[PDB]
Design a protein around this motif. Structure first.
Motif, short mmCIF file in Angstrom:
data_model
loop_
_atom_site.label_atom_id
_atom_site.label_comp_id
_atom_site.label_asym_id
_atom_site.label_seq_id
_atom_site.Cartn_x
_atom_site.Cartn_y
_atom_site.Cartn_z
N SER A 292 0.82 -1.21 0.00
CA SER A 292 0.00 0.00 0.00
C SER A 292 0.86 1.26 0.00
CB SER A 292 -0.94 -0.01 1.20
OG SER A 292 -1.63 -1.24 1.30
N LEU A 293 1.90 1.30 0.84
CA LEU A 293 2.77 2.47 0.89
C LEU A 293 3.59 2.60 -0.39
CD1 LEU A 293 4.04 2.69 4.57
CD2 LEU A 293 2.13 3.87 3.46
N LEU A 294 3.98 1.47 -0.99
CA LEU A 294 4.71 1.50 -2.25
C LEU A 294 3.83 2.03 -3.38
CD1 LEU A 294 7.46 0.93 -3.43
CD2 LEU A 294 6.71 -1.41 -3.94
N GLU A 295 2.56 1.63 -3.41
CA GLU A 295 1.63 2.16 -4.41
C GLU A 295 1.41 3.66 -4.21
OE1 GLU A 295 -2.20 0.41 -3.98
OE2 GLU A 295 -3.23 2.05 -5.01
N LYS A 296 1.26 4.10 -2.96
CA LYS A 296 1.10 5.52 -2.68
C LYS A 296 2.34 6.32 -3.08
CE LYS A 296 -0.32 6.32 1.50
NZ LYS A 296 -0.87 7.67 1.18
N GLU A 299 2.48 6.59 -6.83
CA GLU A 299 1.54 7.62 -7.24
C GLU A 299 2.12 9.01 -7.01
OE1 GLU A 299 -2.02 6.61 -5.13
OE2 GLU A 299 -2.26 4.79 -6.34
N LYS A 300 2.82 9.20 -5.89
CA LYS A 300 3.42 10.50 -5.59
C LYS A 300 4.57 10.83 -6.54
CE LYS A 300 2.22 11.33 -0.75
NZ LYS A 300 2.71 11.84 0.56
N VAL A 301 5.37 9.83 -6.92
CA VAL A 301 6.45 10.06 -7.89
C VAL A 301 5.87 10.35 -9.27
CG1 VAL A 301 8.46 9.06 -9.01
CG2 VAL A 301 8.12 8.71 -6.60
N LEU A 302 4.87 9.58 -9.69
CA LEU A 302 4.34 9.73 -11.04
C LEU A 302 3.47 10.98 -11.18
CD1 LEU A 302 3.48 6.11 -12.22
CD2 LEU A 302 5.40 7.58 -12.87
N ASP A 303 3.14 11.63 -10.07
CA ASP A 303 2.39 12.88 -10.14
C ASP A 303 3.28 14.00 -10.67
OD1 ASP A 303 0.08 14.74 -9.36
OD2 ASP A 303 1.72 15.53 -8.13
N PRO A 304 2.90 14.66 -11.76
CA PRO A 304 3.75 15.74 -12.30
C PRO A 304 3.66 17.04 -11.52
CG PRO A 304 1.81 15.50 -13.66
CD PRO A 304 1.71 14.42 -12.61
N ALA A 305 2.72 17.16 -10.58
CA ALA A 305 2.54 18.37 -9.80
C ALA A 305 3.36 18.38 -8.51
CB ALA A 305 1.06 18.58 -9.48
N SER A 306 4.46 17.63 -8.47
CA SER A 306 5.31 17.55 -7.30
C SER A 306 6.65 18.22 -7.58
CB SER A 306 5.54 16.10 -6.87
OG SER A 306 5.88 15.29 -7.99
N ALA A 320 13.63 2.72 0.25
CA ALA A 320 13.40 2.01 1.51
C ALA A 320 12.33 0.93 1.38
CB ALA A 320 13.03 3.01 2.61
N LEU A 321 11.27 1.20 0.62
CA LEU A 321 10.15 0.26 0.51
C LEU A 321 10.44 -0.89 -0.43
CD1 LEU A 321 7.43 3.02 0.22
CD2 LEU A 321 7.12 1.11 1.77
N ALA A 322 11.44 -0.74 -1.31
CA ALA A 322 11.67 -1.71 -2.37
C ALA A 322 12.05 -3.12 -1.90
CB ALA A 322 12.71 -1.15 -3.35
N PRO A 323 13.01 -3.34 -0.99
CA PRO A 323 13.38 -4.74 -0.69
C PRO A 323 12.36 -5.48 0.17
CG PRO A 323 14.61 -3.30 0.72
CD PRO A 323 13.89 -2.41 -0.25
N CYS A 324 11.35 -4.81 0.70
CA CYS A 324 10.39 -5.44 1.60
C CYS A 324 9.05 -5.75 0.95
CB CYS A 324 10.17 -4.55 2.83
SG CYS A 324 11.70 -3.92 3.57
N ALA A 325 8.93 -5.61 -0.37
CA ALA A 325 7.67 -5.84 -1.05
C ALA A 325 7.60 -7.27 -1.59
CB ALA A 325 7.47 -4.82 -2.17
#
Lengths: 604, 122, 218
Positions: A292-296, A299-306, A320-325
């Motif tokens: 869930s946090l990886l999907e969020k 979504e935050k990275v792929l948002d162009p308004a950041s 940080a989230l990558a090796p634990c999925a």
RNA sequence: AGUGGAGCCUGCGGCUUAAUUUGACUCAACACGGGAAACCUCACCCGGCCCGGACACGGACAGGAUUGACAGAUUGAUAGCUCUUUCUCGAUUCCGUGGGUGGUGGUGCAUGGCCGUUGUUGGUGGAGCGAUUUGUCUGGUUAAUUCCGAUAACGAACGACUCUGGCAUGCUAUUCUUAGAGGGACAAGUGGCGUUCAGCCACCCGAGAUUGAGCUAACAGGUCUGUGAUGCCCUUAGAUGUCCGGGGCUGCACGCGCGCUACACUGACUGGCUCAGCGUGUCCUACGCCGGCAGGCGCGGGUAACCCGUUGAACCCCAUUCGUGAUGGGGAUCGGGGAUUGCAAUUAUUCCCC
């Protein structure tokens, strides 16, 4: 001798029998009363009459405490009071020994009973400013490992809160010396929590009373934050041995992750301590919340308004989230990250290569299944993204290549022979971490070719003839290849075969004739490594050629590289006769040569 | 390896001896306060002093609190150095003045002074 | 390698002060010899006027030391005079060279008759006095040369004075007093006021007040 | 407590001698040269054999130049370095004549080889033209220019160096080229190893956690035998020529001095008693026998906390005789014998007995 003897009885004769004896009080009957007599004698041996054996006596008390504290606790409070009284001397030369003894007593005991024995007199409002028992807080910080956390709550939360309130109250009151002392005291009190988080016995019931407190302390108390982070990290590193403890930590992880994410993602702070805490705290949490946090985060990275800072922070969270999925989340994250390897921003490419390194870092789990599932696509993408890799991004990428060479199959020689010149150019990269990674990666191809064939020596000969042409081209890449051979000569010492090494040494002498200083320096390093490594009996055939080669170098490069030539002359004079090198060198070098002799004369 | 120099050590020693109160746990706040306390021309050794004061305050904070307590006269000497009263000592209600000083003030156009009292020599 | 200590030395080391005459304009003390070695440099020649031994009286006994009188001179411009006593003759010579570089003074050159070409002689007759020694320098026509005793001849040739009449009085046999007196007179060339220098002096900025923004940086 | 007075011994002067070998003359001259010298150890003396350069010139040599040599006769020496025996050795030559011609020469001068690290008075400032002075001082303190403090004096002696790059969408005429300035990196943060303090390792972030430039020469820090076609003086007047035999170094009227033994009764003799330590040994000795006694003989241990060796010490203690005198104190100097050490003890080496 008496101290060593008494230590030997305390370590071997009485120490294994604590379980049978049990707790001793002042009214014991059996061998427990004998243990009481032990402590009475060793406490009577502490008085002023000795005054010179106090190092030995305090060592004896230290070993007695760490041997028998847990079941001799009712009787040793008088000796703890006496030890506290001895530190009040004007000039005590045994302060460190007394601190070690009190720390051993605390380690065997825990802070509660020893604070019942010698109380802290910093309980709220004091009159003077000279606290006599201020060493107890460093003792407790350095030596609490096996007590209960509920004592830490019920004692060190309200008193430290009142000290903080008093410090800030005096801070608007004009007095800035007492406020600083009280702030230092309360910060010292908050550093006990990593000690309390070492091996708690009731962390399954007392962690519920600290979740919101630790959250608010990591949220709106910056001055504690690092220690706070360390506390949680320390807890995990040695506190999730049981299963109910880990269940409680995950049940509160479902609250702690948004807070730590918000503190890491804020603009400006100890970002790396929060990142390490997040890394471990993701390694101890359930995979659905990870997904869930990886999907969020995706979504935050792929948002162009950041913004770019927000994008980089959420990419660090992705790292940080990558090796634990799990496998599906890792595959989707890899599919999203793969177009980012050709981005012109060096930071985005660096984060993408760090993601690729982290997912390949796990030797087992969904990362390893992802590696064996997508090895071909990973090889194709990493070979395609070779041309457009930025200079910082070289440092993680090599490590990722490391993480895909350690489990590489036999039909993969083309990938290695395409990666090799990049690895050499990274052995002369700007970053020292990239250089270390490239050296370790060359070592890793060295090991990887020891698995593709039956004979190791011919495999290493093939590995060398894959890197031999690099001694022919441009000056900087020839120096690259000389440094690569210099590193490679150190681990696989005899496995190349000395005669072949000798041939390489001769070639190095030709490259010793170069005008460029880097090539000469690399040649000197290779000569030093060869003198260190390959045998003196084969050196004696090849002393003359290399020493003639270094003899007719120049004046300028002789003067600049005087210390490397000095060390080479030192090694040659140590390994052979001084007199042979004395005749066969030209004139000026003689003077340098003779200096080495007094080392051999006056190092003795 | 790397080793600290004597100049950074002694400058940091003077800085910690003088203004222990202002220093804090973060590094760049120590750097800026060291920049605004004293005169240091070059950036590099200033950063070296900032790192060294950060190291020694981390070392002192771990040390049992009593070194900090004996730093008590520094502020009193400072508060004494910058003490003023509530009422100025030169703001006097009635000041005694010689007749010749009164003539000087009359000739210098301050003849309309009200706080003056002329005491004749007896 | 020269690492200056004074503000003047730091300005001379940089390209702020272009000529030595600026330092002469504001009468600043020159405390570093590297300023003189920077501005004049290779044009300076040095003649040892005298090496003489003394037996200095100490409680261990009489120990021999050497006293050096050394005149240094930029021809067509500048002179300095230095006296140094030391243990070794080379140490005394180099100390006298340093001390004479610190005492470099400029000399005024004038004309005897009509003013055609470069100045060759002193502008007027000037007098320098040192310990009963009087040295008087009189303007001379072109081509006469320096009509003097050998020691003021050496100093006057190093001053760029092409020609001069000289008159000495007193105990001329002591060399230091004689050299110091002729040095005093050739300093009094710029200590003297003539109708040429009657115009009101416009005051420029001193080097310390002009390059203060550079000096605060170092 | 003595020394200086006595006997003996040793040292230095002096006296003898063929020689009595020698540096030092109130501490540092005086048992220093490990010097307790019978041969060497000796530097001295009396004698006797031997030969002592190259080059040039003149002889002989192959019709042997010269080398080596068993036995016997000589001189103070087994001298084939002479005679009887002349037998071998094959040029490795030896016989005169010479010569500022000298060389395994002596001595001085100049400069260099073998090893590494990078109380005194200067430096700068003040005073005086200068010699000089201040520092280096009123007081107190200290062995002391030491310390406290005063103070025209302040500081001192006897590749961890300097500069500097990576990244700036910032300022300056400025995101792609510029060149000035301002930032940024400091071991800053984390985990381990660590005297828990100096440091080490690895890692995150970060453009950069170390990428490039500059630095045989100096020594008084030690100390010692190479270069000069080097100056002088010597060279069948050997810078101590080798060897052999015998002496001397000890000789003794006397001065100046170190020591040993004594002048006794607090003692001498005889018997009994009982106690050490520093150290040694392949010459230290254990045991038995022959011995009045020095010592001999047969046997064992110890290359050593083991065997000498519980080191079986002497003063001292207890008994006997002596009894205030050149005495039985004191032992020199002599006369006889005996035994070891050593080629040799006669000018007594030493020890024993009247």
């Amino acid at each position: 001798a008496a101290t060593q003897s008494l230590k030997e009885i305390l370590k071997e004769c009485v120490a294994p029998h604590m379980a049978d004896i049990g707790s001793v009080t002042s009214s014991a009957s059996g061998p427990a009363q004998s243990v009481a007599k032990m402590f009475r004698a060793v406490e009577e041996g502490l008085t002023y009459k000795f005054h010179a054996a106090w190092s030995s006596v305090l060592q004896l008390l230290c070993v007695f405490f760490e041997a028998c504290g847990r079941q001799a606790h009712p009787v040793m409070r008088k000796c703890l009071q006496s030890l506290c009284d001895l530190r009040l001397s004007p000039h005590f030369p045994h302060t460190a020994a007394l601190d070690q003894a009190v720390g051993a007593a605390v380690t065997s005991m825990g802070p509660e009973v020893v604070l019942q024995a010698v109380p802290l007199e910093i309980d709220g409002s004091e009159e003077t400013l000279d606290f006599p028992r201020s060493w107890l807080l460093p003792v407790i910080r350095d030596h609490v490992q096996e007590t209960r956390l509920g004592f830490f709550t019920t004692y060190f939360l309200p008193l430290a809160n009142t000290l903080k309130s008093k410090a800030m109250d005096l801070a608007q009151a004009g007095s800035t010396v007492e406020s600083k002392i009280y702030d230092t005291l309360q910060w010292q009190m908050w550093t006990l929590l990593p000690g309390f988080c070492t091996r708690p016995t009731d962390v399954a019931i007392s962690f519920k009373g600290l979740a919101r407190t630790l959250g608010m302390a990591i949220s709106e108390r910056p001055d504690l934050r690092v220690t706070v982070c360390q506390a949680l990290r320390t807890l995990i590193t040695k506190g999730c041995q049981a299963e109910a403890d880990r269940a409680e930590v995950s049940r509160f992880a479902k609250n702690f992750l948004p807070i730590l994410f918000n503190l890491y993602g804020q603009p400006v702070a100890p970002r790396r301590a929060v990142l390490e805490t997040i890394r471990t705290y993701l390694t101890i949490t359930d995979t659905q919340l990870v997904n869930s946090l990886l999907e969020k985060a995706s979504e935050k990275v792929l948002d162009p308004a950041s913004s770019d800072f927000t994008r980089l922070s959420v990419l660090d969270l992705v790292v940080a989230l990558a090796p634990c999925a799990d496998e599906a989340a890792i595959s989707k994250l890899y599919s999203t990250i793969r177009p980012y390897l050709e981005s012109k921003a060096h930071g985005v490419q660096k984060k993408a290569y760090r993601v690729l390194e982290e997912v390949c870092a796990s030797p087992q789990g969904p990362g390893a299944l992802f590696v064996q599932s997508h090895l071909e696509d990973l090889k194709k993408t990493l070979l395609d993204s070779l041309r457009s890799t930025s200079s910082p991004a070289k440092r993680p990428r090599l490590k990722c290549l490391l993480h895909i060479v350690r489990k590489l199959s036999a039909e993969h020689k083309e990938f290695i022979t395409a990666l090799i010149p990049e690895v050499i150019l990274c052995t002369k990269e700007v970053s020292v971490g990239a250089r270390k990674n490239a050296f370790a990666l060359l070592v890793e191809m060295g090991h990887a070719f020891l698995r593709f064939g039956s004979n190791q020596e011919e495999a290493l000969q093939c590995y060398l003839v894959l890197i031999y042409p690099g001694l022919v081209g441009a000056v900087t890449m020839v120096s690259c290849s000389i440094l690569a051979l210099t590193h490679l000569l150190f681990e696989f010492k005899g496995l190349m075969g000395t005669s072949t090494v000798e041939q390489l040494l001769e070639n190095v002498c030709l490259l010793l004739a170069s005008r460029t200083r880097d090539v000469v320096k690399s040649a000197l390093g290779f000569i030093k490594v060869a003198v260190t490594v390959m045998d003196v009996a084969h050196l004696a055939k090849h002393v003359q050629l290399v020493m003639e080669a270094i003899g007719k170098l120049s004046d300028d490069m002789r003067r600049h590289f005087r210390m490397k030539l000095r060390n080479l002359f030192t090694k040659f004079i140590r390994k052979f006769g001084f007199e042979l090198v004395k005749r066969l060198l030209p004139e000026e070098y003689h003077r340098v040569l003779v200096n080495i002799r007094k080392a051999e004369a006056r190092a003795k | 390896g790397r080793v600290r120099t004597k100049t950074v050590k002694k400058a940091a020693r003077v800085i910690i001896e003088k203004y222990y109160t202002r220093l804090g746990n973060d590094f760049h706040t120590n750097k800026r306060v060291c920049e605004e306390i004293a005169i240091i021309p070059s950036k590099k050794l200033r950063n070296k002093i900032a790192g060294y004061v950060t190291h020694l305050m981390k070392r002192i904070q771990r040390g049992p609190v009593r070194g900090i307590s004996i730093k008590l006269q520094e502020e009193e000497r400072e508060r004494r150095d910058n003490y003023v009263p509530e009422v100025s000592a030169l703001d006097q209600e009635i000041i005694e003045v010689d007749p010749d000083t009164k003539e000087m003030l009359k000739l210098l156009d301050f003849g309309s002074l009200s706080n003056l009292q002329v005491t004749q020599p007896t | 390698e020269w690492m200056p200590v004074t503000k003047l030395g730091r300005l001379v080391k940089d390209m702020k002060i272009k000529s030595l005459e600026e330092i002469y304009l504001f009468s600043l003390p020159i405390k570093e010899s590297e300023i003189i070695d920077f501005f004049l440099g290779a044009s300076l020649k040095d003649e040892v006027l005298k090496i003489m031994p003394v037996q200095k009286q100490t409680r261990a006994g009489q120990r021999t030391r050497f006293k050096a009188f050394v005149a240094i001179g930029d021809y067509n411009g500048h002179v300095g005079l230095g006296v140094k006593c030391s243990k070794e003759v080379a140490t005394a010579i180099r100390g006298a060279i340093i001390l004479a570089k610190l005492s470099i003074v400029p000399v005024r050159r004038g004309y005897w008759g009509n003013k055609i070409g470069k100045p060759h002689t002193v502008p007027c007759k000037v007098t320098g006095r040192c310990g009963s020694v009087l040295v008087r320098l009189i303007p001379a026509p072109r081509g006469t040369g320096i009509v003097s005793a050998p020691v003021p001849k050496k100093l006057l040739m190093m001053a760029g004075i092409d020609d001069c009449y000289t008159s000495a009085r007193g105990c001329t046999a002591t060399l230091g007093n004689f050299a110091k007196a002729t040095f005093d007179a050739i300093s009094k060339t710029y200590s003297y006021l003539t109708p040429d220098l009657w115009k009101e002096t416009v005051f420029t900025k001193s080097p310390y007040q002009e390059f203060t923004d550079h000096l605060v940086k170092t």
